[PDB]
Amino acid sequence: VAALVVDNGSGMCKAGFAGDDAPRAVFPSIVGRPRDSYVGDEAQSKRGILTLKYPIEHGIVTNWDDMEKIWHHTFYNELRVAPEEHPVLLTEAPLNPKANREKMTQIMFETFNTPAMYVAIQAVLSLYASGRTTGIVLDSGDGVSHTVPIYEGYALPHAILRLDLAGRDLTDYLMKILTERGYSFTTTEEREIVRDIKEKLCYVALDFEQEMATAASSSSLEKSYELKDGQVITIGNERFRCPEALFQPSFLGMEACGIHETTYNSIMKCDVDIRKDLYANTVLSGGTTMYPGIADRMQKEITALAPSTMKIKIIAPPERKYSVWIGGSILASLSTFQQMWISKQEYDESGPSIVHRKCF
Numbered sequence: 001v002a003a004l005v006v007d008n009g010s011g012m013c014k015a016g017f018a019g020d021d022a023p024r025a026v027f028p029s030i031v032g033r034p035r036d037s038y039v040g041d042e043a044q045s046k047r048g049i050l051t052l053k054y055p056i057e058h059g060i061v062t063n064w065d066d067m068e069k070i071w072h073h074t075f076y077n078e079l080r081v082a083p084e085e086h087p088v089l090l091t092e093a094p095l096n097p098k099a100n101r102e103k104m105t106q107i108m109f110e111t112f113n114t115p116a117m118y119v120a121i122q123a124v125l126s127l128y129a130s131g132r133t134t135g136i137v138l139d140s141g142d143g144v145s146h147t148v149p150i151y152e153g154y155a156l157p158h159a160i161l162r163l164d165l166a167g168r169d170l171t172d173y174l175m176k177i178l179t180e181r182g183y184s185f186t187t188t189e190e191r192e193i194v195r196d197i198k199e200k201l202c203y204v205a206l207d208f209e210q211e212m213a214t215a216a217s218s219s220s221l222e223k224s225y226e227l228k229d230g231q232v233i234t235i236g237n238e239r240f241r242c243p244e245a246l247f248q249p250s251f252l253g254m255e256a257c258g259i260h261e262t263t264y265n266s267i268m269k270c271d272v273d274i275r276k277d278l279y280a281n282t283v284l285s286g287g288t289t290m291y292p293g294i295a296d297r298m299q300k301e302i303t304a305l306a307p308s309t310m311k312i313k314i315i316a317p318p319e320r321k322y323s324v325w326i327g328g329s330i331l332a333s334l335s336t337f338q339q340m341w342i343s344k345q346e347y348d349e350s351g352p353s354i355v356h357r358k359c360f
């Protein structure tokens with residue numbers, strides 16, 4: 001029988017069967033409750049009568065009651081399976097606190113009675129999906145961006161960096177600057193419309209200053225978008241100013257290095273003898289890395305920071321929106337992985353802290 005692959009994020013949850021090339025269910029990480037409980041799409045649609053919670057903040061689980069409700073929904077409503085029948089691979093953020101790993105483990109075995117489980121780092125799974133075991137991954141989702149150096153299958157914790165600027169922040173920023181053109185997007189249902197605008201029309205400029213000058217001298221960069229009621233709006237320099245905040249956190253009032261400088265800073269924290277492997281194997285993952293033009297801009301910026309003789313290669317896989325899930329599916333499918341699982345007998349004997357020596 002097949003193992004199950006579950007990838008829980010700040011914005012979206014992805015789940016399915018080990019061996020498939022895509023997840024079977026993708027839904028919002030939202031739990032709703034009367035002002036008895038609703039999860040996912042139903043919670044968002046019925047949001048008028050409900051109080052909404054987001055159990056995962058910047059990649060870290062903060063509310064365990066609600067996280068359990070998401071897992072019950074994932075098994076019984078979305079995949080339509082019995083947890084006690086299947087081994088279960090779960091995913092976690094880089095630098096997930098020790099206590100969080102243990103509680104995760106406790107709930108699978110004691111609440112859902114899984115015969116087996118395992119937990120792997122999100123960024124490591126993405127690297128695997130690209131057929132590599134050495135490289136540095138930039139993972140940018142809905143709530144957090146990480147840069148993660150990896151060597152022979154092992155993430156290097158001393159060199160991992162965290163930036164709390166991602167897709168959710170970009171959506172809000174686009175709402176703001178579209179107003180300064182005369183439009184008025186402010187409500188929760190309007191936020192969802194602007195999220196669509198962002199995903200369809202936005203892009204990363206190669207040279208920001210020059211792109212600003214092009215937009216100010218003609219309408220060559222303008223694009224249109226039709227709203228539900230038939231109104232057509234027009235967007236110009238907003239198309240590239242929005243994702244520019246990833247490269248300049250100043251735009252949002254943050255005193256922080258951009259995603260290009262963060263990647264270089266992580267590499268510089270690693271042993272001199274491995275840096276060249278990392279420079280030549282920089283991989284992009286997550287929904288927020290989907291912008292057209294993002295790989296060429298990363299290439300340009302890293303080149304200006306690195307030594308002049310250095311070989312720079314940015315890899316941006318076409319399926320990178322789901323490369324965490326696909327990496328898990330690959331791993332849980334390998335017959336040479338089957339003796340890596342934590343069994344329930346092992347749990348019964350050692351308890352939740354067995355996870356530190358089994359999932360290393």
Ligand SMILES: Nc1ncnc2c1ncn2[C@@H]1O[C@H](COP(=O)(O)OP(=O)(O)OP(=O)(O)O)[C@@H](O)[C@H]1O
Binds near residue numbers: 010013144288
């Ligand atoms: N084509 C696209 N262009 C730009 N942004 C996109 C695109 N598709 C999705 N996104 C954005 O990516 C985000 C979702 O990505 P992902 O599922 O990787 O994050 P997550 O796992 O929910 O969150 P995190 O990893 O931060 O915990 C959303 O903010 C969404 O608006």
Ligand SMILES: [Ca+2]
Binds near residue numbers: 141
């Ligand atoms: Ca994620």
